[PDB]
Design a protein around this ligand. Structure first.
Ligand SMILES: CC(C)[C@H](Nc1ncnc2[nH]c(-c3ccc(S(=O)(=O)NCCO)cc3)cc12)c1ccc2c(c1)S(=O)(=O)CCC2
Length: 167
């Protein structure tokens, strides 16, 4: 259960590893995997596309049914759906996409959703092509998340810059 390996503990509740979140989910089958979602839960590329491809599109079929019945999420919001073969549950969280003018204050609301789950495997919210400064996203995670979060960052260069900034 939640057999995370090779993480570096940064704080009492934040751990980090240079790894593909999809490979970590396949190995660990955690209780919760976090998806870096958008408000219509369309998993077209990046982390969301990779997690969806690893479920062979089951995540996308389920997300479409959630959207049809409940409507879109808001930026900073989340929903809990099945984790299929990757985890017991998938927590779809929408961080702001600064490359599109969404406010950075919503990154704190996005990480606050992690607090409803004791243990989570997660990506660094709003980083990559969402345009937020990735070291700033790690500072918001550290100051906002109180439950146990295991961050998988699939880039050794960025992992080293995050760990150098933190230590
Ligand atoms: C900052 C960056 C290093 C980080 N990336 C990632 N972090 C952690 N696990 C990751 N897996 C992949 C991946 C991609 C594609 C594929 S593939 O389907 O092309 N190849 C399949 C081979 O089995 C296979 C894994 C990316 C990745 C990240 C963190 C946050 C965000 C992004 C990206 S974003 O997707 O640009 C926008 C949403 C916010």
């Amino acid at each position: 259960v939640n057999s995370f390996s090779g993480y570096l503990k940064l704080t009492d509740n934040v751990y980090i590893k240079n790894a593909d979140i999809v490979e970590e989910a396949k190995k660990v089958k955690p209780t919760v995997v976090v998806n870096a979602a958008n408000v219509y839960l369309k998993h077209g590329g990046g982390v969301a596309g990779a997690l969806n491809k690893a479920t062979n599109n089951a995540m996308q079929v389920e997300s479409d049914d959630y959207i049809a019945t409940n409507g879109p999420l808001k930026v900073g919001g989340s929903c809990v759906l099945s984790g299929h073969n990757l985890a017991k549950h998938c927590l779809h969280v929408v961080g702001p996409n600064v490359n599109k003018g969404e406010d950075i204050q919503l990154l704190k609301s996005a990480y606050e959703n992690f607090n409803q789950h004791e243990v989570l495997l997660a990506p660094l919210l709003s980083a990559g092509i969402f345009g937020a400064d990735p070291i700033h996203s790690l500072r918001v995670c550290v100051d906002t998340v109180r439950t146990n979060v295991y961050l998988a960052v699939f880039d050794k260069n960025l992992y080293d810059k995050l760990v150098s900034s933190f230590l």
